[PDB]
Every structure is written in C-alpha cells, then in structure tokens.
Amino acid sequence: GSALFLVIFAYLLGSITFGEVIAKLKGVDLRNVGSGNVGATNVTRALGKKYGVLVFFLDFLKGFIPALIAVKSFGIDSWVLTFTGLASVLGHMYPVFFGFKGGKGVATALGVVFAVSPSVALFSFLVWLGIFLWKRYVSLASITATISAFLFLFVAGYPVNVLFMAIVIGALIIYRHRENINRLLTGREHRFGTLEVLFQ
Ligand SMILES: CCCCCCCC/C=C\CCCCCCCC(=O)OC[C@H](O)CO
Ligand SMILES: CCCCCCCC/C=C\CCCCCCCC(=O)OC[C@H](O)CO
Ligand SMILES: CCCCCCCC/C=C\CCCCCCCC(=O)OC[C@H](O)CO
Ligand SMILES: CCCCCCCC/C=C\CCCCCCCC(=O)OC[C@H](O)CO
Ligand SMILES: O=P(O)(O)OC[C@H](O)CO
Numbered sequence: 435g436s437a438l439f440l441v442i443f444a445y446l447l448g449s450i451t452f453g454e455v456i457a458k459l460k461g462v463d464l465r466n467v468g469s470g471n472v473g474a475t476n477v478t479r480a481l482g483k484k485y486g487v488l489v490f491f492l493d494f495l496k497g498f499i500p501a502l503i504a505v506k507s508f509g510i511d512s513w514v515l516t517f518t519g520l521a522s523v524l525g526h527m528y529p530v531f532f533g534f535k536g537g538k539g540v541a542t543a544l545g546v547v548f549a550v551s552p553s554v555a556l557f558s559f560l561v562w563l564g565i566f567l568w569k570r571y572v573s574l575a576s577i578t579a580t581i582s583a584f585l586f587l588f589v590a591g592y593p594v595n596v597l598f599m600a601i602v603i604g605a606l607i608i609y610r611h612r613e614n615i616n617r618l619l620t621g622r623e624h625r626f627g628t629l630e631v632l633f634q
Contacts (some may be wrong), residue, residue, distance in 0.1 A: 436507070437514040444500035444518045448525020451536045452492040456485055469614070469624070473537040475572050477549040483634060490541050493552050497522040497545025510592075516599040519546035523603050527610060538610035540576045547583050550596060558583040568616055570626045574616035580607045 453472035457464045460481055464472050468479035473493065478486030500522055504515040522542050527534040548555040562579035566572060584600040592600075606616075617623035 440500060440503055440507075440514065441517045441521045444504075444521035445525040446530065447500060448496050448542060449520040449529035449531045449536075451526065451529050451532055452496075453489045453537065454529075454532050456489055457481060460485070471537055472532075474541060478634070489603065493526060493537070493541040494548075496526060497542035498549050499545070501546040501549035510632040511595055513595045515550070516595045519543075519550075519599050520602060523606055527606060538576070539603065539607050540580070541581065543583075543607060546599070546603065547587075551587070551590070551592070554583060554586045554590065557586055565624075571618065571623055572626065573611055573623060574618060576588065577608060577611055577615075582606045600615060 451472045453464060453474065453476065457472070457477060462480050464470065464476055464480055470476070474486040474490035497519065500518050501515060502629060504512065504518040508514040513594050523539045523546065525536075527536050528534040528541045544555060544559070547558060558579045561582040562575045565575035565578045569575070581604060584597070584604050587597060587600050591619040614621045614623060
C-alpha cells in the first residue's frame with residue numbers, strides 16, 4: 435500500500451526531532467534550556483544561530499518531502515496528502531523515537547504548506563516575518579502565520595482535504611503553543627531584543 439506506506443513514512447521521518455539529535459550529539463539537553471522546546475528557536479538559544487537555522491531547515495524538509503511525494507503521486511485533492519502532512523506534523527510533535535515529547539510543528543508545517551503551494555507558504559512567511567519584526571515574539575508570529583496559512587488556503591479556494599489538513603495542523607500548533615500563549619498574556623514570554631543582538 436503506497437498510500438499507507440507513505441503516511442507511516444511521514445510519521446517516522448517526522449519523529450526525527452533534529453533539534454534533539456543535534457543538541458544531544460553536541461552535548462546539551464534542550465529540556466533544561468530556554469522554553470524546553472526542541473525546535474529551531476530553543477536550539478538557537480542553546481547552541482547559537484548556526485545550529486538553529488540548520489534544525490529549522492531539517493524539520494522543514496521533514497514536512498516538505500513526504501508532502502511533495504503525496505501531491506505529485508496522488509494529487510493536491512487526495513486525502514493521502516492530508517494524512518501525510520498530518521503524519522509529519524504529529525510525528526514532529528509526538529516523536530516515536532524520543533518518548534513522544536517533541537516540538538510545536540511550525541517548521542514542518544511550513545514544509546507541508548510549501549509542498550502544497552509555494553506562494554501560500556511565501557505570504558504566510560511574510561506574515562510571520564512582519565509579526566516577528568514588529569513585536570519580537572517568535573510564538574506570536576508563529577501563531578498568526580499559522581492562522582494566516584489557513585486563511586490564504588481558504589481564500590484561494592483550495593480543496594476540502596487541504597483545508598481540513600490546514601485546520602487540524604493549525605489547531606495542533608496553537609494547542610502546542612498554549613503555554614507560550616499564557617506567557618504572552620502574563621508578560622513573561624521571551625522577547626527577542628538587543629540582548630541577543632549583542633550576545634547571541
Ligand atoms: C488528532 C488530530 C486530528 C486527526 C484527524 C484524523 C484522525 C484519523 C485517525 C486515523 C485514521 C487515519 C489514518 C490514515 C491511513 C492512510 C490513509 C489512506 O490510505 O488514504 C487512502 C484513501 O483511500 C484516500 O481516499
Ligand atoms: C505509537 C502510535 C503513534 C501514532 C501517533 C501518536 C500521536 C497521537 C496522539 C495524540 C494526538 C494529539 C491531539 C491533541 C490532543 C488533545 C489535547 C487536549 O485537548 O488536551 C486536553 C485538555 O483540553 C487540556 O486542557
Ligand atoms: C497547513 C498549516 C500550515 C501552517 C504553516 C505556518 C507557516 C509559518 C511560516 C513560517 C514560520 C517560520 C518560523 C521560523 C523562522 C526562524 C526561527 C528561528 O530560528 O528564530 C530564532 C531566532 O529568531 C534566531 O535568532
Ligand atoms: C467546521 C470547523 C469547526 C472547528 C474549527 C476550529 C478552529 C480552531 C479553534 C480553536 C483553536 C484550537 C486550539 C485552541 C486552544 C486549546 C488548547 C488550550 O489552550 O487549552 C488550555 C490548555 O489545554 C490547558 O488546559
Ligand atoms: O519560544 P519557543 O521556544 O516556545 O518557540 C516558539 C516557536 O514557535 C517554536 O518554533
């Protein structure tokens with residue numbers, strides 16, 4: 435079963451949290467530093483910007499490659515794509531190889547949305563960039579850009595399987611951001627500023 439095989443492969447590949455991998459092989463436990471997350475932001479806090487951008491690239495590929503196989507092999511309207519993108523995001527969030535504690539799924543979801551539509555991923559990235567340049571909170575930018583990815587796919591008239599994939603990935607990412615959210619509502623969320631400019 436090529437479809438079921440590809441969903442399983444998206445989940446197993448997504449389970450490779452490269453922030454955990456690169457941090458542990460660099461000698462660091464990400465759960466202790468920063469937000470406790472295993473993604474590019476916390477990897478940047480823990481190991482510098484070089485390793486964060488690499489882990490972002492890898493977690494992005496985790497979602498891009500299986501979703502691209504799904505779109506090319508079954509079509510943009512196939513539910514194999516829905517379950518492939520969901521499998522990558524869930525594999526990144528609940529990794530089978532790392533005790534089912536992983537990240538919040540933003541980079542991988544960006545891979546999925548890029549395989550679906552590079553232009554939607556472009557404008558969603560522009561949303562993220564605007565929010566981060568404006569308010570200097572990574573999480574706020576990620577939440578807004580996720581919701582906006584759904585909004586763009588909706589306004590473009592993308593099929594129902596893709597809109598459902600986006601609704602579920604988005605709800606997943608927000609839920610995984612709940613603690614960032616209450617940190618934002620409490621004034622205790624990390625704000626990037628000239629301290630990182632000087633010492634990152
Ligand atoms: C938890 C977050 C929300 C999750 C929301 C959905 C949950 C569904 C659960 C299990 C079935 C999915 C497993 C899919 C297995 C492969 C799918 C497949 O084979 O699709 C081919 C199909 O014939 C094309 O029409
Ligand atoms: C080995 C099997 C691998 C197969 C795939 C394994 C991962 C699927 C597990 C959970 C999906 C999570 C979906 C969201 C969970 C619900 C969150 C929630 O509602 O939390 C409770 C409460 O609301 C708090 O206030
Ligand atoms: C179908 C649903 C899909 C939803 C898709 C949402 C798309 C959001 C777009 C881009 C996020 C990019 C975020 C990462 C950018 C760089 C992160 C990073 O490393 O930042 C740390 C620090 O800023 C370094 O100094
Ligand atoms: C036709 C479609 C109908 C459905 C459309 C749904 C749209 C998404 C709605 C809400 C955001 C999802 C996540 C919201 C946050 C839930 C998790 C949270 O923060 O809960 C507190 C925490 O779990 C501690 O208890
Ligand atoms: O501030 P963090 O460490 O929770 O990161 C939020 C980002 O959306 C994770 O990529």
